[PDB]
Structure 1
Amino acid sequence: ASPFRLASAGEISEVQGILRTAGLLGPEKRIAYLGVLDPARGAGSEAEDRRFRVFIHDVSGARPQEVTVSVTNGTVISAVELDTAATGELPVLEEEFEVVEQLLATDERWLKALAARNLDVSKVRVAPLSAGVFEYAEERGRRILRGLAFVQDFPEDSAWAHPVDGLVAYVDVVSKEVTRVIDTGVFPVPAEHGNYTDPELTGPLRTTQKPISITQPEGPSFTVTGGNHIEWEKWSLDVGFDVREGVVLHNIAFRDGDRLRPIINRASIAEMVVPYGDPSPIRSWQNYFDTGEYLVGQYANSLELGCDCLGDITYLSPVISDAFGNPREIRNGICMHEEDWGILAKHSDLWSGINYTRRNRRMVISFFTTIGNYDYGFYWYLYLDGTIEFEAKATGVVFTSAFPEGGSDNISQLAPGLGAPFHQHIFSARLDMAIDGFTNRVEEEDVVRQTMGPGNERGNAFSRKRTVLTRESEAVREADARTGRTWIISNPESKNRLNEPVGYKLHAHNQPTLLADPGSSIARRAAFATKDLWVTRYADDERYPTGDFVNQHSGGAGLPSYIAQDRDIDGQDIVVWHTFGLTHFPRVEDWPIMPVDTVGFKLRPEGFFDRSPVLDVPAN
């Protein structure tokens, strides 16, 4: 019944038939992206209109199209040819991963470089990497992928231990041409293996780990209705899934007594960028937008009970489309469960003699994704006390290079002759705010130091200042950990019983933002990442901080272009964009597979409730 229900297999078959009868899905076509569109502002129209956005690629070489279709009304709504030299290529196709290794396997120049290194071609894996935009003018308009080579000694070998440095090729995957092959010098191929399941490397496994058993004998405290509508401990929300963004949260709300109070209309990780800091021309072009270029949702793992998700777990299995419009189920793609979170509140009073202790709990909603050497867990947490937290978990295998003779200021050595280039993982959270409704605004809050003097005779005083962001042109903000800087999203027209506007406070981790030079290509294409916080006026088509077509776009689209409109955000329908990430100087302990590292943010109520919202929690 709900317009926010997950796309069904049936709905996706219907989309493929509508594109077929309309003659848009010919045998030369590929679906590069398919997703349900969110209902428009003011869903007061009786009965939904399930619409779908589709990106259609033409392998033969024709121009691609952007298509909207209504499955409610079996009709194509719009269909637009795209000039990709202008607005950007389409997302990388999964079938294109192999084409780079196969195109290179017959190229004369490729084989010359391999033979000079005594590499058997059937042993060389080639990674299909996004091209970006640089100085090669013949790439404009063309669908380009660059290739980096790794040696696999045998089928089960970890190729990441054997990079082939000094060598890169570029590939046009439509016309199937190796446009360039660059060989800047021979580097020794690192010899040590990195197979983390070889008893030779692991040694004997531990016998010391006794089991931890986490059960819920009466089942879980949350309920799911309609496929994806969660109700848990006064929280209410819909779990959506998009093949580009991954897990999306809609209609996050809190049942304060008898009325349902909205908090966030839509929450998602709307882009990630991984820029590399090795200035070597073999790699100085390396930057991946995993979300924008590859679509992280389509590589969601299936999560195993007992290994990935432990406890009483409820699964969701979202449906996406393959390149031909057939429905594909991702079995057990989303984990949801509650877990114990220690003490919520505690006090033993000397004067009343009353002792009081309550436990905290969190709702967990997660999925895990693999793009090549990288694996990423996306975790959303809901806590009893109203706090909302996001956490990214980064693991997998580090991207490797050779370690140069006598060192490097931009690469870490992980094993003899084996290096790891410096890089970042930067995420963009897009928070469509709905603090007690849609009239919201953002204040910046700084700690204020006071000087010893009149009115502050003992020099102990300190305060805080709040600056309202009224226009988009002044809502591009930087962190300042030293002054305790946070941001409050409030509703100026909704007050608590103290006659204060209700609000939520955003707590950032204050990690470094984009390190690249402001004149670089990557600072241009990933402008959102140069700043910690952006606020925009909501608009239906302002969906991604980089725009709709990241692959080989020349830069400027998305956030820098939205805020140019200089719209009013003082008490309006606004969207908060928060940049946060990890700056990774790889360590020996990251090799040969890396332990999880984490980064995130959280939002806590700030005068949203009239008292603590967890007075009614039992003792058990």
Structure 2
Amino acid sequence: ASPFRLASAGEISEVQGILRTAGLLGPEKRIAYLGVLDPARGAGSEAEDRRFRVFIHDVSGARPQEVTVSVTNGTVISAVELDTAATGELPVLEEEFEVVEQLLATDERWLKALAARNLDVSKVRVAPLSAGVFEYAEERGRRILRGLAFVQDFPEDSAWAHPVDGLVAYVDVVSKEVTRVIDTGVFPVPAEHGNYTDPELTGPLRTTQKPISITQPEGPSFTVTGGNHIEWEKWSLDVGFDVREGVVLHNIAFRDGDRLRPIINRASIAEMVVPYGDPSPIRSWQNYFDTGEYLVGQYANSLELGCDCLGDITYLSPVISDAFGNPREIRNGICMHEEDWGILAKHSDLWSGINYTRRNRRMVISFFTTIGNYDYGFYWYLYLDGTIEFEAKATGVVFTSAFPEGGSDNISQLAPGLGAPFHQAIFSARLDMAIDGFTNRVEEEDVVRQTMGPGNERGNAFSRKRTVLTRESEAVREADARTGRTWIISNPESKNRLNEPVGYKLHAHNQPTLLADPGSSIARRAAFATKDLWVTRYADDERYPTGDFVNQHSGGAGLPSYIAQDRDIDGQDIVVWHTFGLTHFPRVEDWPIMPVDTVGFKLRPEGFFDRSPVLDVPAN
């Protein structure tokens, strides 16, 4: 049917059969990534050619491969071998994570570090994190994971409250060798528990909260057809899901009268980096590329009703592949519902005596994921008025350390002896623009202040200026909250009735971008996070700002290499990449579990419609 429908279990099992038949999926092979490909731009597919891209890992040490399969025709369109030391390691496998603690438990260097701190190895949990690329030459080409320890005094104990600072071990997860055990010195291990479920910490629970029942007596106003095709209040789109990106939006279009007008071809969070700012050797290597290295969609929570999604929810249970190509379903991993959103438009006119009030509503599409100690919610919203917004919700338990006696300029104290190193959480939304079609262009709009004088004798005049970004070498922009900088995406060939190109305007939160030194490993690997806006000429292969392979990959791929092509983006098929994120200096209130914090962006019509598109909304 629709070439944008969600991958079915049947298709995932067929991809496995095809790889197998092709001799690409023997016993030593592991699927490190599997996802359906989008229909080629023009006519690269005849009827419907469903293709899947796969990254195949080899547990014996053999070179991995990147394969594209046509589940329709039962063919392997391509299968190339990867030189991982050059182009990057494959995302970490779930199974490689549990390896680290196990190996460490019989390591004499490890055991001695633990003994020096009087810790029972059986109680020391190990957080296996991505390694990144640093000065360890023997790591080039190997799949390394670094482990940090936390004491878990008992079964239901949150070990995050008991970091074991001064110790870290590097583990090669393929050869199963502990490559290094670094012990800088003993630090008292914070003794206070942070068991937020323990009545002796919570105290008696609140009995003051009364119920709020949200209901929809006739069901929702949106319709789901073809499994993931949503139609709501003029809006039309397809909700997709990829194990790497999570919820992905396709064909966002608005039905303006007789015509269905496209707005965004595809929207997704293409990358998410969480860089740490503690300069201690125990943690200066820590950087979570949640999308690129871990694959956030894989860790998507099974949302419970009444708990995570309140109201009249319509759930999608996406299917992903496990390490062997078998399909596993993420039950209720995606929530869809509409929510009241206050007042849309209001005016009490004296002259006419007419009082007009209209309520707003928004369509929500979300999922929550867990990456170790942290949990994140991804929300996409569609409003009656044509506005599109995204919201990231950060929660979970903060990553801890010991708090250095004598304080720290890169670590905050949360409890006695317990520290929390500073970090950021930066996202990259990839917006494949289709404003009334693919012939688009982007303009940077700045407020313009005028001087008092001729033509502006009263000095009250203020204007705005718009600069067309004509080629990629000019499309890497930074925010300017001071001059109200925004970016407008227009279709220079489609005009409204006032003879102006239709458009949409991007409103960014203007938060600080990547703070790390420009010549740091992280600045190079997360070069996208150093600027707020990048615009590129659309290309089939330009999918992630960090490139296809982020794990233990240095710079060389991603946005910086795409941009170098210096292509024409003026009235062309373009893609907008927007960087936005939080900068976190943990506060005592974030412990022992962190209250939800948020970040995001939104786009609003800008001369797209010929007048307000909500003049037909009923009073009800």
Q: Relative to 1, partners in 2 of residues 1:44 and 1:218: Cα closer, same or farther, differing over 3 Å?
A: farther
2:506–2:602 contact (8 Å) kept in structure 1: yes
Secondary structure at the counterpart of residue 482 of structure 1 = helix
Instruction: After superposition, give the CA deviation of every residue in 1:502-553 in whole Å (9 maximum; x if it has no partner).
Output: 0000000000000000010100000000000000000000000000000000
Determine the C-alpha separation between the residues in 2 that align with 1:498 and 1:44: 37
Determine the C-alpha separation between the residues in 1 that align with 2:330 and 2:504: 35
Instruction: After superposition, give the CA deviation of every residue in 1:14-52 in whole Å (9 maximum; x if it has no partner).
Output: 111111111111111100000000000114854111111
Corresponding residue of 2:464:
464
Secondary structure at the counterpart of residue 181 of structure 1 = strand
Instruction: After superposition, give the CA deviation of every residue in 1:111-166 in whole Å (9 maximum; x if it has no partner).
Output: 01000001100100111100000111111111110000000000110010000000
Determine the C-alpha separation between the residues in 1 that align with 2:519 and 2:288: 18
Give the aligned length: 620
Determine the C-alpha separation between the residues in 1 that align with 2:439 and 2:103: 55
Determine the C-alpha separation between the residues in 1 that align with 2:597 and 2:40: 37
User: TM-score, length-normalised on structure 1?
Assistant: 1.00
Runs of 5+ unmatched residues, structure 2: none
Corresponding residue of 2:68:
68
Question: 1:78: Cα distance to partner?
Answer: 1.0
Determine the C-alpha separation between the residues in 2 that align with 1:77 and 1:456: 65
Determine the C-alpha separation between the residues in 2 that align with 1:150 and 1:382: 42
1:525–1:546 contact (8 Å) kept in structure 2: yes
The answer to whether residue 236 in structure 2 is matched with residue 236 in structure 1 is yes
Determine the C-alpha separation between the residues in 1 that align with 2:329 and 2:487: 40
Question: 1:276: Cα distance to partner?
Answer: 0.6
Determine the C-alpha separation between the residues in 1 that align with 2:81 and 2:432: 30
Determine the C-alpha separation between the residues in 2 that align with 1:449 and 1:73: 61
Corresponding residue of 1:305:
305
Determine the C-alpha separation between the residues in 1 that align with 2:114 and 2:129: 20
Instruction: After superposition, give the CA deviation of every residue in 1:186-221 in whole Å (9 maximum; x if it has no partner).
Output: 000000000100000001111111100011001100
Determine the C-alpha separation between the residues in 2 that align with 1:250 and 1:484: 30
User: TM-score, length-normalised on structure 2?
Assistant: 1.00
2:518–2:524 contact (8 Å) kept in structure 1: yes
Secondary structure at the counterpart of residue 16 of structure 1 = helix
Question: 1:355: Cα distance to partner?
Answer: 0.6
Determine the C-alpha separation between the residues in 2 that align with 1:242 and 1:532: 24
Corresponding residue of 1:264:
264
Instruction: After superposition, give the CA deviation of every residue in 1:38-71 in whole Å (9 maximum; x if it has no partner).
Output: 0001148541111110111001111111111111
2:39–2:45 contact (8 Å) kept in structure 1: no
Determine the C-alpha separation between the residues in 2 that align with 1:15 and 1:134: 36
2:426–2:579 contact (8 Å) kept in structure 1: yes
Secondary structure at the counterpart of residue 15 of structure 1 = helix
- Give runs of aligned pairs for residues 384-399 of structure 1, distance below 5 A: 384-399=384-399
Corresponding residue of 1:321:
321
- Give runs of aligned pairs for residues 70-149 of structure 1, distance below 5 A: 70-149=70-149
Secondary structure at the counterpart of residue 297 of structure 2 = helix
Question: 1:97: Cα distance to partner?
Answer: 1.1
Instruction: After superposition, give the CA deviation of every residue in 1:247-292 in whole Å (9 maximum; x if it has no partner).
Output: 0000000000010000000000000000011001110111110000
Corresponding residue of 1:54:
54
Secondary structure at the counterpart of residue 201 of structure 2 = helix
Q: Relative to 1, partners in 2 of residues 1:470 and 1:40: Cα closer, same or farther, differing over 3 Å?
A: same
Which stretches of structure 1, 4 residues or more, deviate above 2 A after TM superposition?
43-46
Instruction: After superposition, give the CA deviation of every residue in 1:437-476 in whole Å (9 maximum; x if it has no partner).
Output: 0000000000111111011111100000001000100101
Determine the C-alpha separation between the residues in 2 that align with 1:156 and 1:47: 54
Question: 1:556: Cα distance to partner?
Answer: 2.7
Determine the C-alpha separation between the residues in 1 that align with 2:562 and 2:76: 28
Corresponding residue of 1:2:
2
Corresponding residue of 1:181:
181
Instruction: After superposition, give the CA deviation of every residue in 1:475-497 in whole Å (9 maximum; x if it has no partner).
Output: 01000000000000000000000
Question: 1:299: Cα distance to partner?
Answer: 0.4
1:68–1:78 contact (8 Å) kept in structure 2: yes
Secondary structure at the counterpart of residue 377 of structure 1 = strand
Instruction: After superposition, give the CA deviation of every residue in 1:358-378 in whole Å (9 maximum; x if it has no partner).
Output: 000000000000010010000
Q: Relative to 1, partners in 2 of residues 1:173 and 1:44: Cα closer, same or farther, differing over 3 Å?
A: closer
1:149–1:168 contact (8 Å) kept in structure 2: yes
Determine the C-alpha separation between the residues in 2 that align with 1:22 and 1:234: 45
Determine the C-alpha separation between the residues in 2 that align with 1:420 and 1:43: 52
Higher mean C-alpha deviation, range 67-76 or range 485-494: 67-76
Determine the C-alpha separation between the residues in 1 that align with 2:52 and 2:456: 62
Aligned CA RMSD, in angstroms, stands at 0.7
Instruction: After superposition, give the CA deviation of every residue in 1:87-129 in whole Å (9 maximum; x if it has no partner).
Output: 0000000011110001111111000100000110010011110
Determine the C-alpha separation between the residues in 1 that align with 2:144 and 2:424: 23
Question: 1:561: Cα distance to partner?
Answer: 0.3
Determine the C-alpha separation between the residues in 2 that align with 1:252 and 1:337: 17
Instruction: After superposition, give the CA deviation of every residue in 1:162-188 in whole Å (9 maximum; x if it has no partner).
Output: 000000010101111111110000000
Corresponding residue of 1:290:
290
1:527–1:556 contact (8 Å) kept in structure 2: no
The answer to whether residue 445 in structure 2 is matched with residue 445 in structure 1 is yes
Corresponding residue of 2:501:
501
Question: 1:76: Cα distance to partner?
Answer: 1.4
Identity %: 100
Secondary structure at the counterpart of residue 547 of structure 1 = coil
Runs of 5+ unmatched residues, structure 1: none
- Give runs of aligned pairs for residues 576-591 of structure 1, distance below 5 A: 576-591=576-591
1:301–1:368 contact (8 Å) kept in structure 2: yes
